[PDB]
Every structure is written in C-alpha cells, then in structure tokens.
Amino acid sequence: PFITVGQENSTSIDLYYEDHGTGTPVVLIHGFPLSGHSWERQSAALLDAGARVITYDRRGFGQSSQPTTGYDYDTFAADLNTVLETLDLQDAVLVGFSMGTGEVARYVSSYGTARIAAVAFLASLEPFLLKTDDNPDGAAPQEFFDGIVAAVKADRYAFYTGFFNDFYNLDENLGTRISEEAVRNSWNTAASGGFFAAAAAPTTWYTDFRADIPRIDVPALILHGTGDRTLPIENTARVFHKALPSAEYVEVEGAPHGLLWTHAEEVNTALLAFLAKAQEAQKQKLLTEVETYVLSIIPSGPLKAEIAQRLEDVFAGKNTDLEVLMEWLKTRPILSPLTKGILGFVFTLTVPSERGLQRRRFVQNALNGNGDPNNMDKAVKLYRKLKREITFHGAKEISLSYSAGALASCMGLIYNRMGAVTTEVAFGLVCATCEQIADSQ
Amino acid sequence: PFITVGQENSTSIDLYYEDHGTGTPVVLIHGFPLSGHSWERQSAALLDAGARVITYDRRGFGQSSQPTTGYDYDTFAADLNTVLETLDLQDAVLVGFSMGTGEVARYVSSYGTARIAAVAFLASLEPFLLKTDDNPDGAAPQEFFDGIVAAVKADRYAFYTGFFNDFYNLDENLGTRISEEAVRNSWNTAASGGFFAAAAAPTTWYTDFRADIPRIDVPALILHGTGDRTLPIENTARVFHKALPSAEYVEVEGAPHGLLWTHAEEVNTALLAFLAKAQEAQKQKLLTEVETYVLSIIPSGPLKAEIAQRLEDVFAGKNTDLEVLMEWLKTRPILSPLTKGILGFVFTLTVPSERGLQRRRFVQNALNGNGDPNNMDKAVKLYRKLKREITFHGAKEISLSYSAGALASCMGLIYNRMGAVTTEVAFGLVCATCEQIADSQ
Amino acid sequence: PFITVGQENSTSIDLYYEDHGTGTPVVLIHGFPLSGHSWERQSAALLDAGARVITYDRRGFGQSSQPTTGYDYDTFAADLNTVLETLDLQDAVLVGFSMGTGEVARYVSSYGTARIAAVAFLASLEPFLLKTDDNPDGAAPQEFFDGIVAAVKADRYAFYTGFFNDFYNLDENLGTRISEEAVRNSWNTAASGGFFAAAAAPTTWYTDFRADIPRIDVPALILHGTGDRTLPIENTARVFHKALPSAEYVEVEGAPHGLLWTHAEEVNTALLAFLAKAQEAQKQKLLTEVETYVLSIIPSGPLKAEIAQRLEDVFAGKNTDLEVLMEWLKTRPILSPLTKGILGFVFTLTVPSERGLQRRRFVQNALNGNGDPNNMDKAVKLYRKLKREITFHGAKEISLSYSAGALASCMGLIYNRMGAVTTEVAFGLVCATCEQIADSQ
C-alpha cells in the first residue's frame, strides 16, 4: 500500500505504508537505514494489546520510491503530515526510532498537536548532535559527519556491515540477543534502499532540534540504551531530558543502538505502559466529556448530585450492581422518561459487567421514537453512517444533523442490539442526543 | 358520509352510511320505514363489546338519496354489495331487521359468503309472505298488500301513525317500554323518507326468498317476537326455522315488531352471544392457521409434538407460565436460533398474561436481522404498511413481497415494542416469515 | 358547508359551519344538546350591527358527523382551532354558551391569543363543576353526573323533554318568554344529534378549567342568569369572577339556563356593548399606530402639535367639520403638497361624517402620481392585491414592495373612489406610503 507525497520529474513520489489491527492509532517511524519492517517485535506487542499500528517507509528506504531530492527534516515531516492527513488519524501516538525521532519533533513543532495524543523518543538524535561552540554537549564535529558521507559513497554495501556492528553491539550480542540471521535481514533491508538516500541521510542527522523541544505540548517518553555506541546517551537522551524535564525517562541497562531487536522486552514493557497511561487519560477525557453532556439535560437538584456521583463511580472503575442502579433510575420522581432512558442507556454501556441482565422495559419504551416509521427510517440511515466512524467527535457531528426523535430511535436500536457500533461512537450518539434535548430547554 | 351506488338521469344515487368503533365488522340493515339510526341501542351495545359497527340508509330512506327506480331486492343487494366492496370489509357479520333480512338472504344467495363470517335474521320476512296455493303458510293474500300501497299513496304521513301503533304494540307498551318521545322520533324518520320509496317499499315485502335459504352457508341466528303483529311469527320465523334447522333460534316472549327498542336488552344479550361464539370460532381458525405455519419450519421429531401441544394449550386458554416456556424454548437442542425466536415471538404474543416479564435476549438476537441496515430499512417500510392493514391475509400477502432478513427484523421491531400493530396483522407477519423460511428448506 | 377535522375508520369527521355578513369576525359556540342554529336571535343582532358571524356544530351534534371518539375538550378545542386556521380568521371574538364556554377557555389556554381579540362566557361551566375536597365550591358530586349519563342512555328522547324544562324554566316562562313551538324546535334539534354524543357529552362537563383561567390574555365578558337551574350561578359564574376579576361581569335578573332565547334582549344589549368597546379598543390600537406613521413624515414644529391634536380629536370620536379641517390643511405653510394630501386622505377617511363634501383638488393633484402611466399601472396591480387582504399589517407589508410614486397613485385611486378597500387595509396602504417617504428623509 502507498501514499503519494510529491513529484519528481515524470514520476510520483510514493511512500510505502502498513495499517494493522484496530483501536487507538500508533505511528512507528523507523531509523537509518532500515524500514517499517524493523518494528516487527514492537508491532506484535502493540497488536495483542489492542492498538492500531501504522508503519511506513521514509522516502529513499524500504519499499518507498527512491528520489534524489527533499532529504531534510522539513520535507520528512511534510511527508509524515501527508500520511496523517490522508488517513485522517485522530488522537494518535507518534513513536520514532533513531532518525524517526527527528520527524516526531519537527512535525510537533511546525504543525501542532491537534491530532496528537502523545509521543515517544527511542534512541534520540535530540537535541543537536553537532559539536560547535554554542553547543558544547554535541556528540561529534562537522568533520566526523563528512567522513561518514564519504564512507557510504565509496561503498555503502560494505559500509552497512560495519555500521550494523556498532548498531547492534555484535561483539557483545551476536548469538545471544540477536541471531546471525537477524543481522543478515537488516543488511538486505539497508541494501534494498536507495543509493542517493543512503548517502544523503547522514547529513540530516546533525539537524538542530533545540527550537523544537519547547513546542512539545503532550505527554512524552524518552528512552535510550546506555551502551549505545551509535548515539552516545551522554550527548543525546540525558541532555534531551534536561531540555524537557516533563518527559518520562527510562534508561535500559547495557543496551545498544539497535535496542528494538536485542532488548525488545524492556522496550515493549516500557512502551505499552506509557501507552496504557495515555490510553486511561484519553478514556477519562472521553468519560468526563460524556458526563457533561449527560448532566446538561437533568434539572438542577439533589437528584443531579446522586446521578453525577454514580457516573463518576462507574467511570473510575467501581463495579456497581447495574440491577440496583436501573431499579433506582426507574423509580426516580421528577426525571422525564426520556431522561431516565438516556441515563439507562449510558449506564448499561459504561458499567464494567452487565452480569447477564436483560434489557429494561422502561428504557426500550423511552428510546423507541414513539413508534414512528419516519424517525426509525432516519435512525437506520444514521446507524449506517455510525458504523463507518471511529471517533467520538466524528460520531457526534454527523448525529447532530438529524432530529431528536431519530436519535432516540437510533439509540434504542443500539440498546436493543439490533445493531452495533464502537463504544466511543456510541457516546457521540448519546451525547449528540443530550445536546439536542438540552438546546430545546 | 356517502357511497355512490348508481345513477338517475342527471343526479347520482348516494347511500348514507356510518362507520364506528374498531374490530370485527358488523353490518346493520334497518327495517321499513326507518333508518340506520333506529339501531342506536344495538350499536351502543356492539361498541362497548369491541366490534366495528357499520350502518347505512337503504335507498329512498333516512338521509340517502330519494330516487324513483330500483325498488326491488336484486337492486337492494347490489347496493349492499357495493357497500361491502367499497369498504373492502372482511369476515363481516350481516344483521338485518324487518326489510333488512331480505338483503341478507338475497345477497348471500347471489354473491356468496366469501366476505361473510355470519348472519342474523331479526323479525324476518322469510320465507315468503304471499299466501297462494303453492305457499299455504303465507301471511296474507295479494289483495292485502295492494291495500297497504293504496293506504300510503293516499296519505303516508297519517299512515305512519297507524303503522307505528301495530309496529311497537303501543296499546301495550306506551309509557312502559317505549316513550311517547321515542315514537315521535320514529315518525319524523319515516316522514323524512322519500314519498315514492314509501309507496314502492311494501310491494317488495312479498318477495319469494325460498330459493335463497339453501344457499345460506354460514352460522345463522333467527330471532322474532311472539306478539309480533306486523309480521306474524307463525307465518315467518317458525316456518323459516323449518327451512333452515341449522340456525340458532330465539323467541322473545311478548315482543312486538319493533323489538329493537322495546326489548333492546333481550335482543342485545342474544345478539352479542351469537357474535361472541362466531368471534371465538374466527379466533380459533386464525390460531390453528397460525399453528400450521409455525409448525412448517420445525424439524419432524418428538420436539415438534411438545411444541404443538403447548401452542394448542395457550391457544385454547390455559394460562401457562411464559417464564418457564421461554426457558424451555431457550435450552432446546436441534432447533435453530432463528426458529426459537419465532416461537419465542409467537408465545409472548399469544400467551394471555405476560405477567410483567422482560424481553428475552435470545429472541432479540434471533430477530435482529444480523444488524444489517438494509434489512432494517425494509422492515421499517413493511412496518409502515402493516399499520394500515387490519386482516391476517392482507398482512401476510404484503409481507411475502419482502426478504426473510427484513421480515425477521420487522418482527424484532414489533417484539421490541419499537412499533405496534394489531394482533391479527402480526400473525400475518410471523406466518409470512414462517412461509419464507419453510420454502427455502 | 363543512370543514374536515379528523378521521374515523373509513369515514371523515366533518363539522357543519355557517359564515354570514361582513366585518369583524365573531365565533359562536353552542351549548348542549343544541346546534349553531340556537344562536339565531344573537346572530340577527350581530348582522345588523355589522359583524361577521361564524357558527358551527360541535362533533356529534346538529348537522355535523356523529362519531364515537374524541369526546373531550382537548379534541373540541383542536376542532375549533382547525376551524379558525382553515378560515384564517384574524382579530376574532369567541363567544361560548354552556358547553361552548369550555372550548373558549381550553383553546385560549393551549393555543394562545394570537388570532383572538376578545372572548365572552355565557352561562359558564367554569371553573370546575365537580364537588371534591380540593374544590368545595363545586356544583355536584361524581355520583350526580354518572346519574345523568345513565338517564340519557336509557332514553335520550324522553330525557330531553325533562332537560329542556329545567333548561328554559318552563314552569315560569312557557307562553311568556318562549313559545311551545320554540321548545318543540329545540327538542327536534337535540333528537337529530348523535346518540353516542348525547351520552358522552355530560362526562365532559366536569372538566377542570382552573389551570386555564390564568392564561386568558384578552378582555373578557362573563354573563349568567341568576335563576339558572342547570348551572347554578353560585357554583360557576360568581366563583369564575373571583378567579378572573379583570372580566366584565353582568348578572341577568331571573334568567334561566336557556337565556339566549328567553332573555335575548338583555343578552344582545350586553353582548353588543362588549363588542362595541372591544371594537373601539382594537380600532384605537390601529388608530394610534396609524398616527405614528402619519407623524413620521411631518417636520418637527408647532404645526406637528396641532396636526397630532386634530388626529387624536377625530380618532377619539369628536365630530370635527371636515370642510374647516381641509381648508386648514390646504393653506398651511412649510408642509409639502405630498404631505398635505396624505393628511387630507387620512382625515376624510377617519372623520366620522363627510357631510356630503366633494373631493379636494389639492389632494387629487397631490396623490395623482405625477400623471405617469407606469406608477398608475403598478397602483392598479397593488390595488388588486389590497382587495384580497383583510388586515392592516397584511396590507402594509405588500404595499412596501412597490415604489413611492405607485403608492401615492394607488391612494389617489382609492381617494377618487375609482376603487374600494376595507378601512384597515387602506390604513396599511397610507402607512406604507408614510414609511416609504419617511425612509428617504
């Protein structure tokens, strides 16, 4: 699969990409000189955990086209952006490795964190690799980088072998953490890449990311191996943590540059944890937004305080007997039967275990749309559109273009299991209904 | 309200008619020289009982047009037919009084009992009023009828007074069973009627109905007053019961011709009873037809015999715990989940009391149409059409023009109380589904 | 003539109605068990006075259809509403008698006084006839009303006689204020009504109108007879006047329930007076609005104060010599000839008596549209549209879509009696002109 990002003379520039699983989107951006297929161990972990894993090949690498232009980070980001906007990804996590970490930063800096929930920096370039006067903490001088460019142009094929030695720490790890076969794979990958790209890539490594680090809006993770020979931890990750103290910081003990493969376990555990905390903060933001819309229709009174208390109770993870809750809702005075049903709907949905209870009569009658064929015809039409959506906001927006009778009917449709949508979309629906009823008062 | 039956020169012939209540249709056909409004006491009883009461004014009477043609029973029936076919009445009961009884017979004879469930003959003309050689049991000779025609033409207004005296037995009943005011009403009614009709009507009274009585296909009721002065019981009802022994026969003791008003109680009790027996035989024919379609999808085996036994049990009126029944259905082996749900649907519907039980999960899932928006879009469309229908056959026929997925979805729609139709229509639906599934096997 | 209000099985529900005279619309709503034709004496008075009299037959009475549903006041009002919206009546007066007074209230309560100028309550049900604990002032207990329903169902025909005795106070008034023949008429009327309606009607009489009385927005009249046997004045009108002190209140001395016929004189005098005061308050609201538009074109000065003073003088009802007035206008300095003519136009129109004066040269020349065929072609077109309008606002709105030359020409057209429109529409025209000239300054 491909996405077109630009043009070169008579050919189009196309980036190879992969899209797997279902759930919260996670974008993995590989390092030099490998491809999206280098993440394989991480991907595998991310799929079993329940995340949407997107991987792609940076221009001039893997199975992407091999142009001879735009080998800089303002372009690489413009690439990534195109990817993000093509797939209309929302609430996404960016994960970059080696070279990938550059995209993350520069993207975040230039284009903003509207779509981005979180970021992760594994074996980072940051802040600024070049050793000058105004950057004393730099890793190497300008002459060292010019030397690598010369080394590749001479013979990239031979160069790879020697690069991968320092990359993986093969004098330590060969036969132990990485197999001879795994190294052979990585070599073929590098070899399949574009000749110009191979030589043009090292020049981008000493890009100045200092003006970009203060833009980093969202929760971040920095990760690095202490035995990293390619990117010295002392000149990158540690000084990167000084510039961004907010970030969560993890040092993996005795790990090389190629810590994705060798130390997959320690990488995954840390990664998933960081994703689990950012996924229980994007679930509590959905839940609390849901709560505000749900409370917008209830009349001010001591009843609104018990209702809110219970919502927060079931939202935080306190297993409450749905049977008692429903029976409590049913018998409430003042509340309109429309209101109780919405609440009813919400609770059954958000309660952790339904315990094998049946659907309530009072809810069914509340959410039936008065038995009007037109409302139900529109509910079916809306339902069709809600299958295609994946976000809360994307669901709520299309839901607001219908009438209050059709929305209720659509809810009841879902309540009655006559259809099925994802949890977040459903919230959008009910919230859209809560806004349509709250705007007529 | 009016129905057009024919044409006279430049004007159309229109019959006044009334349509009240809801349920099994009952047609009331008045006697000479009154209108549909004479039935008022019977109507009142029929509405509280839960029947659809249709009344109309025979040509030349009440508020119907007043032509000078077609004053014979081949026309009066053609009138009635038009009424029946205009309203597309099904499973109807015809009830005739005095002159009305003639229509009933002649209609039944000529046009057949396709639409007719039952008939009733109150104060009947039958079989043949004219006293000749080949009809010795006749009530009066040809000279007696020619004398009435002369009496009306001379002065119909004055004639009515004297007619109503013998009609109601006023020397017995005035101030007692009928009020002076009620008689005054009946007179105004006769007076509002057409002058030609008044004179032309008595000539039809000696119509020969003997060739018509053997055609009477359906269950019948004959009723007459023993003190009937206008139509002697000895020359009508009693000899009518000899020609049709099958009929249910009731003699009201000491009742006049106008026994509708005077003896309303005895008339209603008898009438409703006769309607109640013919309404518990048109409910058992619906139930047993329903049973045959329901059993058409089940695999032959010892399970089909228990299922049938229970259907017959709940169809006959034996209150069976729906909870036990459902739990029995749910746990059955061999039966397809589609089958159980249909059965589930049927039972909840036909069981006398639901006892406040909720809707079953297993049924809901069975009848959801797989959560396919198209099936449900069609179910809504069918549902709309099923609101308009009133019969089992009218429902089943339109249901058979849709797919098996949409029918199931429509059922589930009704099961979930997201809509509502009459009981008989619903049967049509489920039966239509039972035929669509039984034809794919 | 008929208006369709709903549906019963295969027949439409149609209300009989009458529309007579020309002018300000007045709606008369009859009492039980009579029809629109009971108002005859009032109507006659209202036509000679110069009012538009609309009368109709409530469902189940008179010549209206005779269904067996919707016998409640939420339906009776929905009926009345339909009538009002069908005829697009504006600035209407509702007058209800006995049962009619219920419609008035409930209509006013539910649907608002957008169309209604005023109301009148003759022999009122209000506020609440039923005697309970929370209504001690009630007229009778629940058992008394159940007794009437039983009395009718038994024999409505006989019941009417006894009802009309108490209705009219026949032991007092027979041969004196009402004739034996007039009573016979009322009986026939009741007798022609629907049998179900007759019995269903008394159940509506104890409707709770207390929540409806505070809604009564407009000027009201309450009227009742002190010798009223059917509706005791002490339990209705007097306690009704406590709940609505704003109302104008009139007690007719020694009058029965049927005070429409018996005491026609005292009813009419009071009624017309109330209509005359409410027609000189909806004429002063038109007049003062007219005044504001007329004064919008005049230059501020001592001349604007004399002009306004005269307008108010002729608007209040002080007969001023039009000859002197015109001669005063003509000779005024500062005023534009266009302005004088408008004023001229207004005065001749609003002055009570023209005294047989001719049309003024100076006005004719002012309002001729410069003798331009195009302005006059448009004036004719506007004139055509002004014939169809009946309101001030409806007239002014269509007038504002033309040019200032055409409006003047149209005015002159009307001034010259080359056409004719109603008074209020004319005001709209001139006011529309006054706004077109005032917006160019």
Short mmCIF file of C-alpha atoms in Angstrom, two decimals, chain A residues 26 42 50 68 87 100 152 229 257 287 295 307 330 335 359 368 395 439:
data_model
loop_
_atom_site.label_atom_id
_atom_site.label_comp_id
_atom_site.label_asym_id
_atom_site.label_seq_id
_atom_site.Cartn_x
_atom_site.Cartn_y
_atom_site.Cartn_z
CA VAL A 26 0.08 4.32 16.94
CA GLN A 42 7.03 -3.90 18.82
CA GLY A 50 -5.30 -3.67 21.26
CA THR A 68 17.13 12.39 -5.23
CA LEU A 87 -5.71 8.62 6.90
CA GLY A 100 12.40 8.70 13.31
CA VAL A 152 28.92 5.41 2.20
CA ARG A 229 27.68 3.33 20.50
CA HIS A 257 21.56 1.45 19.40
CA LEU A 287 -15.84 9.81 30.07
CA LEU A 295 -25.76 16.22 33.03
CA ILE A 307 -26.62 10.87 39.39
CA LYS A 330 -36.71 3.65 37.08
CA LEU A 335 -36.99 12.89 35.78
CA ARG A 359 -32.86 -5.05 28.65
CA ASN A 368 -38.41 3.73 20.71
CA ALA A 395 -19.84 10.45 15.53
CA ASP A 439 -30.89 23.06 23.31
#
